[PDB]
C-alpha cells in the first residue's frame, strides 16, 4: 500500500449505502469467496 | 382433417397442487405466456453443440417437463367444458391463446385441483367449431398425453408398412439430408403444430418413415452399410458429441420390407432421456405423427406407472393393444456399437473402446441429474427434474427386446 | 406439368445439395477444433424448416 | 399415357415411368430454401 499497490482481489457489487463506505479497509467477511456455494468461475475464453 | 384427441393430465407424484408456480407463466420462450407452439422455442437459434439449460431448467427435457404440468393445470376444457382458473390465471378467450390474469367484472370459476383428469376433447364444442385456429393445441395436448402415460421417458410409436417407401415419400425425404436428429424433431413438431393436416398427407407418412428410420440407426441396424431405402444416420464419436445424427443418403445394400407390420410403442426407462437432446428429439419427432393421426391402437398396460392403469381411450389391456418395448440408453448404444462391429464398420478393438467412451458420457448424464434432483427436490413446488430416484439409472428392462424389434423391422 | 425426366433430374440435384449440406450449428466446433482452441467462437443460427 | 398424373384416377404422387416413357403432367416438389450465412463473435484464449 505505501507504494500504491493493494493486494487481495476486487469485488464488484452494487452496494448503495449511506454510511461510512470504506473501499480499502473492508469491515466484515467479503461476500462470496471463490469456490463458495453457487459461485461459478468464468471459463478461460469468457465467451457469452 | 382430424379432431378427436383423447388426453390425460400429468401426475402429481403425491404433491398437493400441480408442480409449477406463478413465475413459469411469464418465463416461457417465444410467445409470452402462450404454452402452445412452445417446446422447441428455446432452441430456435443454435449457437453451438452445448445443450441449452439454465439454473431453473437444469436439463434438456426440463423446458417440456414444466410446460406439461403448467399445461394440465389449465385444461378444464375437453374435460369439463368450462374455462376455470388456477391461482388467478386463465386463457384470454375461447380460442385459448396466452394466459393472462383473471379478468375482472366477469371472472371464471376456480379450477378444482385434481390428479390425472381424462380429456375427451369433444366435451369442448368450441374446439371443432374453430379448428383451423386452435389446431396447435391438439398437437401439444397429445404430447402431454404421451409424457403423462409414463413415469420414465415419453412413449412414442414406431410402425413401418409391409411394402417399400411410397414414390412421393422418397422424393420428399430427399430434403432433410444434412439435418441432425435434434433439428428433425424441431422441423417435425413445428410442422404438425400450425395448420390442420390430413392423416394421409405426404409430409405425414414421410416424417413417420423418418422416425422409424431413425430407430434402426439408434439400434445400429440401419448403419452406413444397411439403409432402409437409402437413408440412415451416421453417428460420431461418443466422446466427441454423440448427439449428432444427420440423415445421410447412400447407395449401399438396402434391407427389405418385413413380412408384417411392426407397430410398436417405445420408451426410455432410464432417466437419462432428461438431459439427452437426442432422446428427447427422437421421442417428440415420433409424437408429431401420432398427433395428426391418433393412436394406431391402445398402449399395453404390461408395465407403465401406477396411474396410467386402464385409461379411457389411451391405455388398454385387451387384444386391441400394442406392446410397449422400453429400452435404456447405455445398453442400447452398447448394443448399437455391437452391430457396427458385426458387419465390419469398426474394428474389434473399437468395440470395447466406444463402450468405455460412451458409458463415461452417460455417466456425466447420471452425475448431472442426481445432483439436480437433490438441489431441486419436489415438495419445494416445481418439478423440472421429475423424481426418478437413484435406485435406477441402470436396471435396463426389455431393451434386448427393442433391439430384436429393429432386426425384425428391417429384415 | 413437368416432364418426369426433368423432374427426376432436379429431384436428383436437390439431393446433391442436401447431400453436401452442413449442420450450421456444428460450425462452431469445426472452427473451435480446426484452430486448436486458441480461437473460440459462437455463431447464432436460426434453425428453420 | 403421356399424362397418367393429370388424367388417370389411380395416379400416385411421385410415381414416374422414367426408364420407359417421359410423363408430362407430374407432381414436382417446389422448395423454399434459405441460405444462412454465419458471422459470429470470436474470443481468444486469454494469457492464463
Coordinates of C-alpha atoms in Angstrom, one line a residue, chain B residues 19-29 32-33 56-57 66 70 74 86-87 89 99 381-382:
Chain B
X19 CA -45.8 -28.9 -9.9
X20 CA -45.3 -25.4 -11.0
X21 CA -45.8 -21.8 -9.7
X22 CA -46.7 -18.4 -11.0
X23 CA -43.3 -17.4 -12.5
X24 CA -43.4 -20.3 -15.0
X25 CA -46.1 -18.5 -16.9
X26 CA -44.0 -15.4 -17.7
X27 CA -40.8 -17.2 -18.4
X28 CA -41.7 -19.5 -21.4
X29 CA -39.8 -18.7 -24.6
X32 CA -45.4 -14.5 -23.9
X33 CA -47.4 -16.9 -21.7
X56 CA -34.2 -23.1 -13.1
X57 CA -34.2 -25.5 -16.1
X66 CA -42.6 -27.9 -16.9
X70 CA -48.4 -26.0 -16.5
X74 CA -55.2 -25.2 -17.2
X86 CA -55.8 -21.7 -11.4
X87 CA -54.3 -19.2 -8.9
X89 CA -54.6 -17.3 -14.2
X99 CA -52.6 -17.0 -20.2
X381 CA -43.0 -26.6 -5.6
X382 CA -41.9 -27.2 -9.2

